[PDB]
Design an enzyme around this catalytic site. Sequence first.
Site, PDB file in Angstrom:
ATOM      1  CG  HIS A 178      -2.099  46.468  31.781  1.00 22.78           C
ATOM      2  ND1 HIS A 178      -2.079  46.812  30.444  1.00 22.78           N
ATOM      3  CD2 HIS A 178      -1.278  45.394  31.902  1.00 22.78           C
ATOM      4  CE1 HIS A 178      -1.274  45.991  29.791  1.00 22.78           C
ATOM      5  NE2 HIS A 178      -0.772  45.125  30.653  1.00 22.78           N
TER       6      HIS A 178
ATOM      7  N   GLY B 103       3.465  38.985  28.817  1.00 23.16           N
ATOM      8  CA  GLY B 103       4.661  39.671  29.256  1.00 23.16           C
ATOM      9  C   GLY B 103       5.280  40.584  28.216  1.00 23.16           C
TER      10      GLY B 103
ATOM     11  CB  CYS C 120       2.142  44.562  28.238  1.00 22.25           C
ATOM     12  SG  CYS C 120       0.692  43.563  27.827  1.00 22.25           S
TER      13      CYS C 120
END
Lengths: 306, 306
Positions: free
Chosen positions: B41, B143, B145
Amino acid sequence: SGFRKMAFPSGKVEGCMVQVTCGTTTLNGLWLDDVVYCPRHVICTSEDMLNPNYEDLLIRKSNHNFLVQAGNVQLRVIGHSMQNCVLKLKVDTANPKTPKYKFVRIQPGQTFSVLACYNGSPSGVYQCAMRPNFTIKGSFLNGSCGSVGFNIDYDCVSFCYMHHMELPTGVHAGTDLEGNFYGPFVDRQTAQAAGTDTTITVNVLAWLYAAVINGDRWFLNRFTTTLNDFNLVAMKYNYEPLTQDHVDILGPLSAQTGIAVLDMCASLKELLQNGMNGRTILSSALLEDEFTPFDVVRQCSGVTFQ
Amino acid sequence: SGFRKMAFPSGKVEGCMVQVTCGTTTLNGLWLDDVVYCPRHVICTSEDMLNPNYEDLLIRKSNHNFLVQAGNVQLRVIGHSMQNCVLKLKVDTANPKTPKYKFVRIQPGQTFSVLACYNGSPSGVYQCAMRPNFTIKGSFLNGSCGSVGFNIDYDCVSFCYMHHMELPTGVHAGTDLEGNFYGPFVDRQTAQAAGTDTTITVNVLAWLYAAVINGDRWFLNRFTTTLNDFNLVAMKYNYEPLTQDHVDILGPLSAQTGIAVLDMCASLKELLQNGMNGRTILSSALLEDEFTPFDVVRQCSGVTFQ
């Protein structure tokens, strides 16, 4: 979202960890530039520790009596000094892995990360608070001496703690990196009383703010309190007295959440006088005092380093 | 002595952390040999995330659309693949700081250390349990991830987790390093129910052993129990059922402390049916289930790595 007891990343400190052997005893040392720092009781046996004369014991040793290993490398000791309760071993080679660093003596109530090491080898890393009575409640086995606590701001490693001993009571005592003990302790195997400990009130308040930021709100009330009134409650429950310096340090948390510091105090007094009633705050059933207001802001905003 | 929730030293993993930017979104990536791993993603915006067609979205991107930074170095993407829910970005340069490593899919109930990162920069490190319902209760801001959980045995880094999302309920979900989600979750911004969670019974028992090793003994009784009897109590309190495989894993702890596993069970049933009565175990007022029996043995014996 979420809130955890987080240690600093330990990369920059792992590269400084070495193993120091003087005859019998082996413990950990810290290799910065071309000096290795370790506790001076590395020159003791276990009977020496009853009542050691470090001055005399170290006169019996020469440079070549200190075996220092950095992983595979055996390091070359070419000068040895005693500064308070630490040994400074001068070495042939500067550490290519030396980070930017400071030596800091911290305040009771501040927190730091500990890198627990054995034989110069890192075992794991955890976050600690220096208790008001200058002990730390750590995890230190035999051979963990020489392990260090530290903070990081962006690129700088601020070394604040070196582990020296475990008290008969099970808590831990150590020095700054200049070798001055925190608290009234000495590097001798005798009964040594730590002061009466107390709870770090400004830290419990920071953690309550962290809880509000993360959705735990049940403890908020519309009661309020004065500073002097809250402090009578604090003293009854063995909490550190809250001062205006503490209120000011909680300013940014106050402003983010819209809850005035004295409103959080009235929440806290209620928790102290009535407990949690089988509820939990950030998944804990005790009041947590190992988060400074800076720790909360760094974790609730995402501060990074290198 | 002492017992702490300890993370693994994060040195070997810090050197692999990079920053991955595709147009709008920036998150963390893991650079091993000459491949960078990050959540797919990263090619989404925030509206894409409502119902993304990753297949179509990635066809719209070329090698030069992926900006990957490793500290100062800007890295050169020369090949991109999608494996399940992870993106594999092939790069010009192999990581000189690549440790020995494995990819592992862990079991519910096992623990790992998470290195929380932002913009490719490590923020801090903490220890986690994979809940029975395949969530983790972490600390992840926007942020974060691409952050990874991992174990270390001596010289090998076993990567087991990559962070992908935060559920509306506040818990966290992610994949192994092959990109297969733990649990029923998907990388889409929709309501997603995590299963009913339960307590990891074998871990609570390991922690009770850790407490006995460290002097907390008040919960020991001379009552005992059967396995089938204990399991009726476990089911009532939403504890994972204890099996003989679990008893056998607790063997070494049993043997060190001289307390049979079924005697610790009878201690636990009493704690479950009567609480702690305002006492604490290892300074906690809840039953702790984030220590595996291996974690306890490593910390109570001092296992080190590199």
